[PDB]
Structure formats: C-alpha cells, structure tokens
Copies of this chain bind each other. A is one copy, B any other.
Amino acid sequence: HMVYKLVLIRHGESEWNKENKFTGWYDCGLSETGLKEAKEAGEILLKEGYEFDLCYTSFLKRAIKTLWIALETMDAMYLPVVKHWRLNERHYGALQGLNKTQTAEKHGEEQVKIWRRSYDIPPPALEVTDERYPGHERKYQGLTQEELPKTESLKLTVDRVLPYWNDVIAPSVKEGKRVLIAAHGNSLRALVKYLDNISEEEIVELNIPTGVPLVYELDENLKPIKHYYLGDQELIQQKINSV
C-alpha cells in the first residue's frame, strides 16, 4: 500500500488584513508579519526534512510570495511551480475593499457575520461594470463568464476548487510527486472538506492557522490516513483558537 504526503500552507497576514478590509480576490501583498510567517514556514519544513517535487499556488500575490519565500528559505527555488486561479481565496463580492468595522456599523454585525461565516449565503454581488469585477483583469482573460465570480460563498468556493484538485493536483500526487500547495483560508478549507469528508456544520468552524505547514498522509486511493501540523504544538493551538 502506498502512502503519499501532501503539504498545505495558508499565507500569513496580508496588507489588507492589517487594514481591516475585506480582501477576497483583491490582489494585495503580504504585511511584514505575513512575510515573516512565510519564512518561518520554510524554516520548519527545512528543519523537519520535507522535500518537494512540485508546487501549486493561486493567482493572488500574497500566496505566490508566500510560496516563493518558502522555496528561497528551503533552497528549492528551481522546483516547478504551477499557479491557478482555482486556488484563489473566496471572492467577497461587493464587500471587497470595504472596512469590516464600517461595514458592520452600516449593515449590522449579524448580517456581516452571516456573510463571513455562513456556508451557503454569499456576500452581495458585484455588477460586471464594477471596477472590482475580475473580468477586467488581464490575469483572468482565460475565464468564461460562468467562471468569473461576482461573489462567492464557501459553498461556491468549494465548487470552484474541487475540479482543480480532481483534474490536476490529485493526478500529480498519485504520480508520486511530493506536492506543496500555498494558498488561502477558504480554498484550503475546501480541499480539506473534500479530503476528510467534513460536514457543512463542521467546516464553517474549522480555522486553519496561518504560516503552519499542514501535512496530509494519503493512502493509495488518496484517502487520508492521518494529518498533522508541523511546529510547536502549543503555539499552533494558540494560532488555531484565536477566532
């Protein structure tokens, strides 16, 4: 029986996180803390003997830079990297760019909480003529109108991520390539919801810590055997339990 190891990294604090703005597909960079966390994740992987053959990341520079920093730290900069929009963060619709506190003062704390934490209720949608509509970005020129999001719930993020796992990433894993994925909270949640068959009720409660390698050991059918976080388990638990 085969065992494959898959490693996931959620990027750390972004510039817009620090500024208390909804981000979604807005393409902001990492903050100094996010940059520090990317290097920390690389150092942990190097200390623990992790070696990779192939890396995946999103089209968003906060995840791409996380991967590049990790690879530089691991002296693995020559490795093949595949970037794809299907690993993007959940799209935040017409909330993108807005201050979270002002948005809650305007529309109500509970309504914003629903937009943030519901499985299936999306934030308000963009119109295609909005400056923020992804169809205006050259990076999304290849997307059909059905693929370009105006807003996403976690449910819709799952529907977008899982085809990429099934058609592209999983075959690479089955080939024996040791894969590292650097991506985002909701797209990594989508992946682990599929792998561990997590209920809608449980997945909305799952908080993947930032800057912490998450390792899945998968059997010959890519069914999980076990998973674990790398690092100081006391510090990891604190990262998990903070919101």
Contact = CB atoms under 8 A, between A and B. Distances in A.
Interface of A: 27, 51, 59-61, 64-65, 68, 72, 75, 77-83, 85, 138-139
Contact of A72 (B59, B61, B75, B79): B61
What's the number of copies of this chain in the assembled complex?
2
A64 B77 contact: yes
B78 A81 contact: no
Contact of A65 (B72, B80, B81): B72
A183 B80 CA distance: 16
Nearest to A51: B138
Contacts of A68: 68
14 contacts: A27-B75, A51-B138, A60-B78, A61-B75, A61-B77, A64-B77, A64-B78, A65-B72, A65-B77, A78-B83, A78-B85, A78-B139, A79-B83, A80-B82
Most B-side CB within 10 Å, residue of A59, A64, A77:
A77
Contact of A59 (B61, B65, B78, B138): B78
Contacts of A77: 61, 64-65
Contacts of A75: 27, 61
